[PDB]
Amino acid sequence: MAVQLPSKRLEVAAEYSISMLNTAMALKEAIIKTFDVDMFDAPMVHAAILGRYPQVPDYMGANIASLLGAPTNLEGLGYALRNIMVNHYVATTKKNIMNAVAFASIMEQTA
Amino acid sequence: VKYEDKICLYNAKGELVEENVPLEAISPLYNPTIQKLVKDIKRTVAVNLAGIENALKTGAVGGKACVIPGRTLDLPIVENAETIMEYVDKLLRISPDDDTSVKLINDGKQMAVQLPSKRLEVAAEYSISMLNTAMALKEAIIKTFDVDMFDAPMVHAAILGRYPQVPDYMGANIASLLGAPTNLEGLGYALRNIMVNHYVATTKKNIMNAVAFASIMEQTAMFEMGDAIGSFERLHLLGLAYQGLNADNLVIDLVKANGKNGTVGTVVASIVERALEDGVITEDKKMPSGFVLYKPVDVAKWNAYAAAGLVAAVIVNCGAARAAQNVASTILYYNDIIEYETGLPGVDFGRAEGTAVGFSFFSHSIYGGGGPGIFNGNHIVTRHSKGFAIPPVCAAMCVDAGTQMFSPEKTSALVGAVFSAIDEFREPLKYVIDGALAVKDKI
Amino acid sequence: YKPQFYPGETKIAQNRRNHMNPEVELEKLREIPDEDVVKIMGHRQPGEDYKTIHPPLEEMDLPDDYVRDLVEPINGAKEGHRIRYIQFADSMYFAPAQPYDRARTYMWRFRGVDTGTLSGRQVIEMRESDLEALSKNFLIDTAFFDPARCGIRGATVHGHSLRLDENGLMFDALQRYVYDEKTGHVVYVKDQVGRPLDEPVDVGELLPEEKLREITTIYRKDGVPMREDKELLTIVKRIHRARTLGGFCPTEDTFKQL
Amino acid sequence: EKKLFLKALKEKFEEDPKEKYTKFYVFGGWRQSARKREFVEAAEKLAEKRGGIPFYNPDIGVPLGQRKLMPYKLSGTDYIVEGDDLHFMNNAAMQQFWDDIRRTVIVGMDTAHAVLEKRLGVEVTPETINEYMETINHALPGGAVVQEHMVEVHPALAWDCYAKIFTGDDELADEIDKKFLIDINKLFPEEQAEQLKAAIGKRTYQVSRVPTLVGRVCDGGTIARWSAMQIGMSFITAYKLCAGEAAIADFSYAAKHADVIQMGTLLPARRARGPNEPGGIPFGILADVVQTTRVSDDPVEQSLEVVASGAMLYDQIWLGSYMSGGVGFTQYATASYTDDILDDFSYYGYDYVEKKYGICGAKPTMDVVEDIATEVTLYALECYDEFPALLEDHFGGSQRAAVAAAASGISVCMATGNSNAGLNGWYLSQILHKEYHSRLGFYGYDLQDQCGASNSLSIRNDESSPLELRGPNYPNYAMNVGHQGEYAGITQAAHSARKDAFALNPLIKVAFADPSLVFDFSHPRKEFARGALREFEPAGERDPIIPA
Amino acid sequence: EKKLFLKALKEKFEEDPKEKYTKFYVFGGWRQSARKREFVEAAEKLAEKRGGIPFYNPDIGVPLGQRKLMPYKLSGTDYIVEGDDLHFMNNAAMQQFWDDIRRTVIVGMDTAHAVLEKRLGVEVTPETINEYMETINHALPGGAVVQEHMVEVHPALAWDCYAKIFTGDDELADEIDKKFLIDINKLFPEEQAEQLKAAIGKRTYQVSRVPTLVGRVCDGGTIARWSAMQIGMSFITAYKLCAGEAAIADFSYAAKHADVIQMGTLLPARRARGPNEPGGIPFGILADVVQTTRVSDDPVEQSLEVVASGAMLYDQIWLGSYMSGGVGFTQYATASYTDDILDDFSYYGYDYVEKKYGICGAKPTMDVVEDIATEVTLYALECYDEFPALLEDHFGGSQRAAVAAAASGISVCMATGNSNAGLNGWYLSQILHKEYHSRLGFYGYDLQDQCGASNSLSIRNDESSPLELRGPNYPNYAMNVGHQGEYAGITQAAHSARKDAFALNPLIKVAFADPSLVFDFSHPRKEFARGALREFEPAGERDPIIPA
Ligand code: F43
Ligand SMILES: C[C@@H](OP(=O)(O)O)[C@H](NC(=O)CCCCCCS)C(=O)O
Ligand SMILES: O=S(=O)(O)CCS
Ligand SMILES: O=S(=O)(O)CCS
Ligand SMILES: [Br-]
Ligand SMILES: [K+]
């Protein structure tokens, strides 16, 4: 599934992790209501979506992903757009050289 | 709209502004001034030119007690603040018609820098503002005074401190209302990393405007965290309306009725009677002793009624003693009493009570914390309540007659000096209602 | 609206309600003149000047605040008097006042109070002038206090959960108060921090267990078990469930499961 | 006879436990303690070494010993020790408990074996695995395998350093030397061994035990790196691969990120710490470290054995030192594993449940949780009313709040088998305890308990989690004593009720069943007593490189 | 006579150092080493304890000893030790060097004294300060001061635990007991003592030394907390304040955030670690830990003493264990402080500079940096050409690259007194060394050196910093050996040229001048030799609580 938050949510947001968090919650509420998941079974739904969060500050064992890794894992400040795996640029481009170089260069130079 | 809830807007002086306004007109998702607050917070950086100048002159850079002998630079930075502001503006400005703002604070000793909003639109997070200002300041200072290439590293240390060795801004002479993303407790907590004193200095110690600002950022942060999604959106929207934005004049009416001879207990009796009167709570069952156990007719609304009374309870208690230390105890026992008075759940279903338990502890123990003002929604002690504990804390620092070591003056000297000048930041209640009126018919 | 104060069907729940209700004059049991009280607190001396931290409210040009001025400050805040403490360690053996009990009474009857509840101690921070006024009339002279089961303590508060001594006094590792074999009364030889006072202050006769049982706010298997108060257990179970359902889903339909 | 704790109380105090009155100030201060006497005799003897600098003197501040300085009987043992002997600093067994966890890291082997057979074209065979296993037992303690002119770590400092193997594939198990294998079929009852193998699959794992000294000089973050560093070298040597090839980089990433299982994960910047620290260990993972599940058939004993280990690690070492320091939180933890007090309450709750619902006989509902949790709580506090010496023992209200709630929570888990149901039970106990004695814990004890009921069954991002995956970094739990260790016990109770072989991680459960471990994870309480009697020999001592 | 290293080479090899040819494979393998012999005799003796499990065996993999297993002479000493004796694991002095830093935390006292006299209304007087100082020396090692029924830490485990004071206010110094005071006027030459006091001001600071054992059981993050926890208690006791008041919270925040000075700061999530770890220590701070500045008048000796300490901490402990592990990076560091090789090159550079520019006689310009850096580099590599045994000694090109560049950098700092100028000098040396021998270091050695020239004088946010404030977390420097320890040396050189009392932090400089410290920070190289000869007695041993 592909989820895109309305851009306004990010306009009133301080950083990008809002997209993972609002999708995580929307998925939980959807799954629990649809199948009338018991209140005592409901914690397992959170663990299936967000993994071991909040004990782990990162998305360990999460079944939802973003091109951007969590702000906790940044090397330096402003590095957020740089936290994109080489393969992600290569899979998105469908292995086209010029489009892979363009995408990586765009994010790297924008960063 | 999405919800049928209608709210009557009241100002900081308890005067009616407009009636039957949609509840979603105060939503961070719809209010244009809340959108402005966030946008401007994310792009505004306080600059201490006097600090930068003193740091170079002495060689005192990269943290406290740090002095590098043999690397001193005497530059008349403050004297030529007007040329530095012209250079910084020129380096950050995209177009002559953009929102770029570079202004002098306290006769050029301090400086206020606002990046053009477009820079943040193409940015992944808020730290861009600190980083682009840091660079613009370096380039400005080095070019203006023709700083030698071998002396230039000291200029970076005077502005950004010990970065990049330290992942944070240790010993930096530039500040933002938002702390670095590395120091976040949880994801989405970015807007919560604002010190209580910062809210109090920006507001100029006005209670209603302090509660409004803290509530606005705290409740807007709940939306970022994904805490105000689905069933919870209404809970947080009513919480922002009644607790922080004085909806139906609830906050003021309770302060007016308990100002003279009222206690926390009387504030509790007042909000219960009010809630029961408006039909937000009804009697469930009468117990053997004759004690009436109440049930909520409207769960999200009862919590909002309780949250508004909580702010009134701190105004009445902390305001009677003119001390901000009472806040931790007031927040605790307002919820503790309200529960054993009616049998209903307290503010944030025990979360605001729990937050206060730890707040009382750390503002009175050896393990950590400190004065009520140093805390924030991103602090491990005060992060448990979801936007309902930090706003009442702001109301307490406002009435305190300087009985704190870490009072607004000592912690929010540089930070407060900038945003108190911005109209929407000093008086947020006045402009969110104007922002609600501008959208009330377009939703 | 007539407030309920506290749920429950036992005498203990009624004693907690009487302690909270500002209209219930608590039975006076002793008379401890003001001069002697301040001495046990060990902050200042009688017939002396109140040390100040901030100047009076009238001498300050504070910014305008319409809401702030509605709250009428207490006399201690008006003349800028310092804020000091007074702590009590209450025996679990039928002491007239109890930690959380004290806290909800203070928040119901007194203005601008900073109270702090712990198991072994209970701290109240208030404006020295107004503090000493209630510390005598309400905190010591009434049924809210007992010289043997309520230990006035600053540090080393250990004793609340400890077995009593030979003569009915609570454990006090700092010997602040001793039992007098002659008068049959408790005399504080030291203040709450543990500093020796030149002139010892008598608090009065110890109350027998028989009457402490009728005024106490603590449930005990020896006295009134919390199992007996079926009403209090009901409300606690409810507060618990309302919190549980509130955290799960804050809807009116969810709350039908109460 | 009667309550389990009465035997212990009669030994601690020579008075009737039901006696409301006693004698004080007659014990001659600190002199009543053979331990405080030793400490003075030590401080006096050490004056010369410190020169003029003053040291430990009991005459500074409060005079300890005005009451009876009571000893502590370890639960389920006849060993009565002084309180000071149960402080982590003074106890080598408690230090080795933690050291044995810190130096543990489990690594997958299938990924490497696949790289060997696919891109490298090297066949993997049991005989080769056995060769690798011998190479890693020389390399891991600091032995050279590839380069010339290499200096090495003294084997006498790293005698506790070894690397072992375990597998769910029974066919590969019979074909590996018994000395290198952690045998699931021999260490666990066949009911449990089948459940572990079913969950693990036919996969193969390596348990690397870095030397104790490493974590003592360095930190928990060193452990996974030390292991990965030597795993790679042993793979280069045993299979005769190139000393620095493109394929090597696949092994380093797998051994450090992809197929590596740490005990604890990293912590946020405020309480910044690397992985394999007590703050990063989830409650279920710690329950799986304890081995009483494969030794005892008693579900109460199993749960209370995890409470002991948890209370010690989380409140004495973690919150007591790492997060605080000084005198620490020894008696905040001892309360949960001494004098059979929590034992008596937990057995009452088990019996209550067994006869009303039956063990694992009730699906979790608010009516069940509220019935059990109220019953056990009322019983616990009543024992404190009946016996003044039991109240004098658990003097701190926090100790009482923790013990009474742990018994309530474990008992809810005994009926439901749901960790969150028992978690919810704990929070009702807390608010009941508050209304009973009109007090609870210390100034800021019930932060997590007032937030508790709402966040116990919550679905929100920083509020939700099954107890097994909660831990010292869970927002509400990140600060206060008398909670964490007992949550690890409530976690075990849900699985002991089901007769589960493990709670969260079967690899960790298998890993800590190894007799080559210094600390006996099957009997933590008896092991703590062994350390308190100075009978425990730990690893990490520097005798071979220091003057005698 | 001639080169300084020739004496050491003639002792290491019984052949002419200029001889191009030698005999190999005649040394009988590992048997030539009295140390490898010990390790085998130990591993054989320990077979019983490990049961069947195989251990250290030199017959696994490469056969060490095919060449001559050469010993190492410590620079500036007549002590020749085996290489294995210089491994941090095998050396108790190296372990105490780090332990003494980790357990250090400096706290301001003026802030507390202000709170005492303003909001609390308690007068502060020298006699009260002296009382506080005695209370903290009982509290800090684990002694009780406020509560009844407190268990305590054994004084015999914490004999190395103490808290001292120091002040720039000479009037307050004469009025404090000499036993509690670190006297600036008595430990430092009066030229230096005046520079320290001028920089510190009339302010008063407390140095708290948490016991060694604490950092060994726990981590570096524990240290500031342990100190703050006991500082608060001692303030409560000494001044008789309320045991839990509103004002107490001001002391906890000051002692943990506001007026606290740590040795190291926290690290990012990838290399997640708390404060007071080697990765968080800036180069200038480490230079200030070394005390040779107040003992020697030789600016070269001072710089090379910081190189030794830096190489050991950063490459042997930090990068060698914390960030890697196993056999480690012992000889990557020994190269910089053994056989007087870096000593000879540095003295050449000093003499070159002294006669052309004069010590601190040239303002930094690209012409100066390029002249010195090329001169020293060409000289260093030429010595390696002249003497085949010097090349056989520094066999690894990385060792050579580090040594040759360190000499170049220190020499640029000798003329300029600018740390970035010397830093720039180092990077020219590296790219010159590459073109000379058509090789440099290991596969990924010059990441930071190729980035070096551009980032050395950069102004960009993650590129700029004066060397004093750079460290193991500086982006380019965060991974590779043979750099960090030498950067700490280049930092000292800029200040030794100026005759500066300190480089970055005068508090740290004063703090580490205390004779109550276990490790002698004034002679690090001789101390490493003492540990290598098993003559160093460290703290943190558990003899009082373990069976004999
Ligand atoms: C000074 C404080 C303020 C603070 O932040 N922590 C203190 C003291 C601190 C110190 C005691 C240091 C010493 O004695 O020298 C230590 C050991 C932590 C440390 N810093 O190393 C500690 N408490 Ni305290 N502290 C305890 C406790 C307690 C209980 C004691 C009640 C009683 O009647 O005895 C009360 C809280 C309450 O009332 O609920 C308490 C408060 C207090 N505790 C009051 C002192 C109150 C007094 O004057 O007596 N502790 C406990 O509840 C039991 C465990 C015990 C801990 C020691 C251990 O676990 O071995 C210790 C935990
Ligand atoms: C609150 C916070 O302290 P600070 O406010 O950051 O000084 C936190 N400490 C703790 O929670 C210490 C826990 C151990 C002592 C309390 C046990 S009840 C921490 O260091 O992250
Ligand atoms: O007295 S406090 O509750 O502040 C700390 C108890 S350990
Ligand atoms: O051979 S490599 O350069 O990969 C590592 C040298 S330590
Ligand atoms: Br009765
Ligand atoms: K350690």
The small-molecule ligands in this entry are:
factor 430, Coenzyme B, 1-thioethanesulfonic acid, bromide ion, potassium ion
The span between the termini of chain D is: 52 Å
**Cα gyration radius of chain D (Å):** 25 Å
Radius of gyration of chain A: 16 Å
Placed side by side, the strands forming the largest sheet of chain D appear as: 4-5-3-6
Number of domains of chain D: 3
Q: What is the string of helix and strand elements of chain D?
A: HHEEHEHHEHHHEHHHEHHHHHHHHHHHH
Key phrases:
part of a larger assembly, 5 chains, A: 111 residues, mainly alpha, 0% strand, D: 548 residues, Methyl-coenzyme M Reductase, Chain A, domain 1, Alpha-Beta Plaits, Methyl-coenzyme M Reductase, Chain B, domain 2, 3 domains, four-stranded antiparallel β-sheet, two-stranded antiparallel sheet, 23 helices, 4% strand, globular, binds factor 430, binds Coenzyme B, binds 1-thioethanesulfonic acid, binds bromide ion
Chain-wise SSE layout:
The structure is cut from a larger assembly and holds two copies of chain A, one copy of chain C (258 residues) and two copies of chain D (548 residues).
Chain A: H1 7-11, H2 18-35, H3 42-50, H4 86-92, H5 97-110
Helix pairs in contact in A: 2-3, 4-5
Chain C: H1 11-20, H2 34-41, H3 75-78, E1 83-84, E2 87-90, H4 99-109, E3 114-117, E4 122-127, H5 128-137, E5 150-152, E6 177-179, E7 185-190, E8 196-205, H6 209-215, H7 230-248
Antiparallel strand pairs in C: 1-4, 2-4, 2-5, 3-4, 6-7, 7-8
Chain D: H1 6-12, H2 34-45, E1 72-73, E2 80-81, H3 92-102, E3 104-108, H4 110-118, H5 126-139, E4 162-167, H6 170-174, H7 184-187, H8 190-200, E5 204-209, H9 212-217, H10 220-239, H11 248-258, E6 260-261, H12 283-289, H13 299-322, H14 331-334, H15 341-356, H16 366-386, H17 388-393, H18 397-416, H19 419-437, H20 447-456, H21 484-496, H22 506-511, H23 524-532
Antiparallel strand pairs in D: 1-2, 3-5, 3-6, 4-5
Helix pairs in contact in D: 3-23, 5-10, 10-11, 12-21, 13-21, 15-16, 15-18, 16-18, 16-19, 18-19, 18-21, 19-20
Bound molecules: factor 430, Coenzyme B, 1-thioethanesulfonic acid (2 copies), bromide ion (BR) and potassium ion.
InterPro entries (chain C): Me_CoM_Rdtase_Fd-like_fold, Me_CoM_Rdtase_gsu, Me_CoM_Rdtase_gsu_sf
Family (chain C): Belongs to the methyl-coenzyme M reductase gamma subunit family.
Protein name (chain C): Methyl-coenzyme M reductase subunit gamma
